[PDB]
């Protein structure tokens, strides 16, 4: 049975003049494991993963700026803003070497940080991560018109900002099993007001699909190139049919990435942590000793 509670004491740290919230559990020494969520989630997404890792390793799960329990400064909320705040968060906590556990826009942040700090990354576990998607044909058909509308002037803001489409529509449609009302209310809480929803609209407008936007496309290409030459231990979780990482892409990564273990989790769309947390958490726990 998949837990709905969030039994983690809040921790806060001042970052660039704002407060950021994070989970921090597990032993106080050793290599920390840094869990990075994406859109439109928070550290809540990791709530059933972390308890598998916390017996043996420090677990740190921040809420990205403007998300979860973190502050909501007056930012553009472009990808580079998230880069700046996560960079400063990692330094504020004095992290030296880390293991990354990353998902969605948290994976773009994590891989981009790893490329810039390769000596500090001891391993990377990832799932449903940001890759350059070559055509809209590789996007799931049932969500293609919706994500094209998110990236259409005016219409996308009406859907995401005014109608909260990313929380009420996309989030439950990208989990195979049904989310409960308690889980939905945890995901809803940081975005109850439209004025808080800018990050939810910025993120799909930065997805690198069919070459655009060019700046994100090049950045993601750069860290994918880094990943392909890196000897760092890697662990990929994938499901079927997937969203960002269809089975054919999981197969391509299994062939091309060095030092990669792959784990098929069964049915899965995008929020794989909500479909098979016990397999994801237990397999990360089993993989960490080999690092």
Numbering used by the authors: 3 to 293
In the authors' words:
Haloalkane dehalogenases (HLDs; EC 3.8.1.5) are α/β-hydrolases that catalyze the hydrolytic cleavage of the carbon–halogen bond in diverse halogenated aliphatic hydrocarbons via SN2 nucleophilic substitution. Structurally, HLDs consist of a canonical α/β-hydrolase fold, which is composed of a central eight-stranded β-sheet domain surrounded by several α-helices (i.e. αβα sandwich architecture). In all HLDs, the active site is positioned in a hydrophobic pocket buried between the α/β-fold core and the cap domain, and this catalytic center is connected with the bulk solvent via a main tunnel and a slot tunnel. After several iteration cycles, we obtained an 11-point DhaA mutant, hereafter referred to as DhaA115, with outstanding thermostability (Tm = 73.5 °C) and thermophilicity, as demonstrated by a substantial shift in the optimal catalytic temperature (Topt = 65 °C).
We obtained crystals that belonged to the space group P1211 and diffracted at 1.6 Å resolution. The final model contains two enzyme molecules per asymmetric unit and has good values for deviation from the ideal (root mean-square deviation on the Cα atoms of 0.3 Å; Fig. S1†), with R-factor and R-free values of 0.16 and 0.18 respectively. The overall topology of the secondary structure elements is very similar to that of the wild-type DhaA. However, specific backbone re-arrangements are observed, which encompass the L9, L10 and L14 loops and the α4 and α9 helices. Additionally, we unambiguously identified in the electron density map the presence of bis-tris propane (B3P), glycerol (GOL) and isothiocyanate (SCN) molecules, which were bound to the DhaA115 enzyme. The bis-tris propane and glycerol molecules are bound on the protein surface, the former being also involved in crystal-packing contacts. There are three SCN-binding sites per enzyme molecule; two of them are also located on the enzyme surface while the last one is deeply buried in the active site cavity. Analysis of the enzyme access tunnels and the active site cavity in DhaA115 revealed that the volumes of both the main and the slot access tunnels are greatly reduced, and that the enzyme active site is occluded. While partial closure of the main access tunnel was previously observed in several engineered DhaA variants, the simultaneous closure of both the main and the slot tunnels is a unique feature seen for the first time in DhaA115. This double-lock is enabled by: (i) the triplet of residues (L148, I172 and F176), coupled with the re-positioning of the α4 helix, that lock the main access tunnel and (ii) the structural re-arrangement of the L9 loop coupled with the re-positioning of the α9 helix, which lock the slot access tunnel.
